[PDB]
Amino acid sequence: ILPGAAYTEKSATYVNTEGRAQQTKVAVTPPGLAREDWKIIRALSEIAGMTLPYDTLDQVRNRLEEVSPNLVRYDDVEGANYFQQASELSKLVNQQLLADPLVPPQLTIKDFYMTDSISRASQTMAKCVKAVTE
């Protein structure tokens, strides 16, 4: 187990459902011996003799740019095209539609409150679940 940082404890990049890149900021440092997640992997790479070519948050973000330039255009929605090309490729292999009706995982509010590790560990979310079931 390698203790990593939570989203309140690091400056990290997340892309939302529309493709917009945004970054968190450090509010508090990680607890105990926990460490920034990308730094753990960078430290692991060196000990294993496969050192990664970036030593700072800025440098790993320069790397992000090499792989996808939109990932460092913070707060911008770039916009993607070529729907026709994607549509032309989805018509090749013909997959069959199952007979099961479409049921979303969350049908009522009781399913909304706990969905990830943070909210599952939250005592307030546990009180909300208890409230909307009793």
Partner 1 sequence: TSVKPIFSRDMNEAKRRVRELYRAWYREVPNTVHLFQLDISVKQGRDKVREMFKKNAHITDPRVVDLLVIKGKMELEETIKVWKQRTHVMRFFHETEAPRPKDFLSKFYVGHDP
Partner 2 sequence: QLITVDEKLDITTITGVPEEHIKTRKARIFVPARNNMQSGVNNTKKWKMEFDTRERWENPLMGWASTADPLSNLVLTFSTKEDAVAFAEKNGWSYDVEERKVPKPKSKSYGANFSWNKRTRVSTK
Partner 3 sequence: GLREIRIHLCQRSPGSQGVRDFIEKRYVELKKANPDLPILIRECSDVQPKLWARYAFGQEKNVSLNNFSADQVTRALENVLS
Binding residues for partner 2 (CB under 8 A): 11, 25-29, 57-58, 74-75
49 CB-side CA count, 13 A: 0
> Binding to partner 3 by residue 98, rule CB under 8 A?
no
CB 18 within 8 A of CB 79: no
Q: Show the site string, 48-77: x = touches partner 1 by CB under 8 A, - = not.
A: -------xxx--------------------
Give the nearest distance from C-beta 56 to partner 1 in angstroms. 6
CB 82 within 8 A of CB 97: no
> Binding to partner 1 by residue 38, rule CB under 8 A?
no
Structure tokens at 61: 């973000």
Structure tokens at 102: 């479409």
Q: Spell out the alpha helix ranges (H) of the chain.
A: 37-47, 57-67, 83-90, 117-120, 123-131
Which entry of partner 2, partner 1, partner 3, none binds 75, CB below 5 to 8 A by partner kind? partner 2
> Binding to partner 1 by residue 11, rule CB under 8 A?
no
Q: Where does this chain bind partner 3 (CB under 8 A)?
A: 66-70, 73, 76, 78-82, 85, 88-89, 92
